[model samples]
Target: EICEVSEENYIRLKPLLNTMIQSNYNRGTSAVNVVLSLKLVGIQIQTLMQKMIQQIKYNVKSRLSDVSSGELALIILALGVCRNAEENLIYDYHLIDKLENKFQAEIENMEAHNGTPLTNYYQLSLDVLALCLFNGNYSTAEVVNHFTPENKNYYFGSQFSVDTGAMAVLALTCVKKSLINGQIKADEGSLKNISIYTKSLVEKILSEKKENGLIGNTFSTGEAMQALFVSSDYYNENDWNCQQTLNTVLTEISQGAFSNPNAAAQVLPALMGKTFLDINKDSSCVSASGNFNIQSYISVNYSVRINETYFTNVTVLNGSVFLSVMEKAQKMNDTIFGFTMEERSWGPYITCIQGLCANNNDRTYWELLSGGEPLSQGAGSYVVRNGENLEVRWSKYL
Candidate 1:
């Protein structure tokens, strides 16, 4: 089972875990999310969650306003998983409830606030799952209805984010588990209907499975796998495992040598065969310690496009692909770096670049591509190779 974390995978994922150790719990929202993910594999790490929860302690009142909705909600979920039934570990702390309360909505909050650090369907789904983990007295139907055909789910609008839908599916599966656990009460018929809703989500993911052995991209494929695994009530591992997406992810994770912490965290849960709902399950995972001296650096060549007519190429010494591009833009005057960003524990987000940002208003934002293929991960999380081709253009959700 993927949830078991093989000896080989432990080595593959250890570098990332090492970084977590080094950070001493002070890290970005993306990094913190990774910690939350690691705990889901079920080993009760005394310090990891304890430290992470402590970091979230400051600004109890303004926590949501301080962190983006996705990051804030994710931390709440992490605490739930970290403590399991011992939720008082977090609920008892000087935790931030103001922002956390915002997540208990019908559709998921799209931003930490309405005006900045834009969010997408993906963040929305994370918020949904976070709410479920934080509180079992949630209205599952309210969240499930945001989708089409069956959902009252959050992937609103036409343009789809693979991970967004995938996370929603995962959230639905949690709701199913809650139903079974008697945490959330629903009638037998209603439960059956909910299962059907979940099935549609799984089928939708399978229908769009990419040939690169991923449901979306490297970032989201892990999330998709997580959804599928928990949603075993709807699909078999083989049903969507044909591309060997799991193996492909593992291979890529090993190849990257776990240098990319955010990416590794995103995929680790899938590789573990566990879902957000399994946060409390006990793990027999053994740790692989030490630093990884080998780290690969690549050249990322990015172009800024406006209306397909104006294009300018910029060369960036890439670390995390999108970030390098944005760092360059921020330095140069012509680049006109206009973005929506906020400080989150995982890190900072470049929500919008080149004056166009992700908002419900125009529904337009920057899109990144390589060889004309849309990147599976965000720029902050995407890895670039030597002379890697890249582009950022304005695009829409539909």
Candidate 2:
């Protein structure tokens, strides 16, 4: 006798191997196949959730915290439902509620401060809440709507400026909706409005750059341009429709009438293209040294009276040696002529002219002859001839 078992009943009894073996092997295989298929689906869901968590952690560290929390909550919700089939997915709803409560606590703390909190910080937190609401997390949605421009103005007044912070928040909200719906969900009107608002903000920042005289001046302008470009690059990285805005900023910088060598050095690192370093070798100086040796001779004739009866011809030949000791002085690290030469060679010559004659006199006869024994003595009509000569020489060491 054969007993018939339906596919659903076979799956229920698949884990009971002995009962299946006693019945039909083919029926047991069908049951095992159903169980294996379900397990594979479960594994796939776990893998996806793990990947989402990792991505969330990375984005948060990369300064995308404003938009990561809501995305992460939705992923956790999906994982919790898939992991426990028997329980209602509403438990995922509770997890989201906890996240919302934490966010609310943060906002309340910010409000407790005396003055107005930072506009960017407040807007970023709101953007996270908006994502929760847009993804069917309605409780968090209500908290986000409470901070809408209309409501926030009633409490804070116009003190909160709607600048880049506002645009970034709006863009993030639109992007979150698109991501959760798994499609391009933004309306044409909303996209157009965002584009207009973003462009206006970028234009205003660029205008500030111009008014600061950065357009025509290179030195001061480069810093201003860098600040503007860095901020725009950050916005572009986060915004889906920021391409046109980024392109316009680059165009303005290129066409603007400022050029600087210093600015070029700084701006080149941020640019993407071919670049090269060129230096002038010809502008450098080479090593060379020279020395000058000068010699001069002067002839003078004077008469000495001998008792007014007769005068004798006295011819004096003055020799001056000017040794330009540059090479030797440089080698010895000496600046003046006194330090470069050997003392024995020029010492006597320098001391010989100390005191006998006027200070400007170059003759060394005074000190040479004073308190020294005479080499020779003559008493006669000594007529020194005009052709008589005296020689003095100086040498420089290198």
Candidate 3:
């Protein structure tokens, strides 16, 4: 299966999801981005979000490359929604100006590994969404329905990605809205053609939703739902079919969120059912997303170290803290965190860390330490306090 089945305790999952988020983003993101983005998981990241915001504020220009294509557009979408933050409006200003300049450059000189150009649907859709989100001065095609039959192999190529097609529609929607509002310039007939193309993409996604309701999996379904809501508002009865489809996706959510943090980020923004356009003016984020506590997604920090160096900071909500620690490492950098089962029916026997792959044949493996002390309980079952330090290093003898 492409996605994990829902299994963990909802209470356990809530803080765990937040811990998952806090462990990452040593990278940069908008504070409002976290709040609006993570609504799907239902964790209140406003506290930690503020902390991350302050760090990026220091070197705004140097630290902003979250990633290529999708992530690049993601940040712009974050700013667009967060520009009118209820409390922190100042953070919005300088960032967008810098992003737009960088965006135009990337648009001109876009390429990836093996030097593939930008006609591919995934990237093209991302660029479209990003441009549509900013609704800016530097405009491209007023109409983009580039799923040419000539390039049929690549046209709908993400197994005919509903995610891509959906995003394309959203960008198309925004472009149309912008043209009407006079924010962007475009021809009348050209706009009409793209709108029809956009609808085709949306219809395809609606048709393709999985039996339990997922477009691709936890990740793609979240994105698809976001795209699904693009035509109308989130609570629209007219959107009943998509809403029913959305309920199927919501069922897969464990605890307050999904098992994957990366998927949760994008999905949460959509859960509030706000489109990228909603980010432009003042709008309240949708707070009612899941069964998880809005308050528990915050509080506490922990430390992760490899060998004796390469330290990383993380945080969790409460109890089962050790699980959060290892899981955070697993999610943030799985290259260092790994395991081998001691038995087929029991034990997620952890076996390696940072290339120090344990010799399982010899029953030798890595050990866990909390606050410079070795742990007696299994990493999965251990309870931990906030602000504790955890360490993992090769041990020749236990």
Candidate 4:
């Protein structure tokens, strides 16, 4: 049998909760992960949960337009998970109705501006997943057509993003169930296409399994776990080595791979054998009395490098986000450091640097990196560590 919740495994996952609580730059999606994960394991931190809920409520009212469809989808999902907060946020905000509009805008933008979603397929998948889960409106046919396994939105550079593929499976699985349950009326052809698309996506995710049993990278493994957990019917029993993957992830946890709140949030549910699909399902959690343990950082200096040019000795308070570093660089010297950003649900997305704008039509965008490795967190969310070297490169995706 795969690993169940052992005291040791719980101890390893426990640190992730503190990381989320200790976070200085609170985010909607990040908060959702922590909130959902906390609920899944029947743990309670009322003050912490309330703080995250307040942060999300503020985002709902103040940052609605700025949020991406996926961020909004996450907010909706989080609200649904926090049952008491659901009515307060959902009805007052008309979020389900708003999400419906946002999803439409994403589709319209894609059609108007070459197939570029307002966000990407990952977020689009979240949008569809949220709508489907909450009983909001969406077309099953559209879901089938846009979510084919071959969609370029599912990749970074030339590699398929296992997490993206996994998210699409979760979304498609929800839509497929809704159709089967008659929640949404759909034709037989559309239904068949949804199955085909999900099946291929499952295949793509399984294809990325590493020697240690991680489906993709360490960060992606959590969502991949949930995807496989939910879509087990799509593949035969032999297709996935669940025990091996679980063992590897559990080992990584002891090694602190999930010390990041976002990483921990994702893997926590899977550790407990839960998924985002379980967001709205009822569960009873016992209150636990414990104070969160969070790490503190001191102000530090870092470096920011553009494609070829470098801005060294950029200083900020400890735990400042990458965007703050860029702003400081611009303040010091605007000629080369001055850049423009677009407000997205995820955060501020860099669109132009030194008068050079990334064109969606050209498939070129500003890629953010840390110490030469591409960052999974956005510029607004990635905390700049002491002595870290950050880079923003003009790059094209395949």
Q: Pick by TM-score: which candidate is best?
A: 4
Note each model's CA RMSD in angstroms.
5.2, 39.4, 13.5, 4.8
Candidate 1 C-alpha error for residue 310, in Å: 2.7
lDDT ranking, best first: 4, 1, 3, 2
Give me the displacement of residue 72 in model 1, in angstroms: 3.3
- For residue 317, model 2's alpha carbon misses the true position, in angstroms, by 69
Cα lDDT, model 2, residue 323: 21
Worst lDDT run of 10 residues, candidate 2, spans 272-281
lDDT over C-alpha atoms for residue 355 of model 2: 20
Model 4: lDDT of residue 381 = 71
Q: Relative to the unseen true structure, what is the C-alpha lDDT of residue 101 in candidate 2, on a scale of 0 to 100?
A: 47
Please state the error at residue 177 of candidate 3 in Å.
Answer: 1.0
Model 4 lDDT, full chain set: 0.77
Candidate 4 per-residue lDDT over residues 1-398, each given as its tens digit: 23455666566666676666665355434566566666665666665667667877777778677767887887777666635534467667888898999898999988888787877888899999999988898887788778888888898798899989999999998988888897888878777888888889988999999989998888898889889888866887777778788889888777766656667777887777777777663433345534455456534343444456565577677778999988988888888788998754345889998899988666788888777778877788777886566878788877
List TM-score per model, in order. 0.75, 0.23, 0.55, 0.80
Candidate 1 clashes: the total is 22
In angstroms, how far off is 90's CA in candidate 1?
Answer: 3.3
User: 331-358, model 3: which lDDT tens digit per residue?
Assistant: 7677645434332111244655555666
TM-score, cand. 1: 0.75
Tens-place lDDT per residue, model 1, 74-185, is 7666666643444564556523353345544323343234421245546656766666555534455555445343332233335345677787777766676677886676
* Model 4, residue pairs in steric clash: 67-345, 68-345
Alpha-carbon local distance difference test for all models: 0.59, 0.29, 0.51, 0.77
Rank list by TM-score: 4, 1, 3, 2
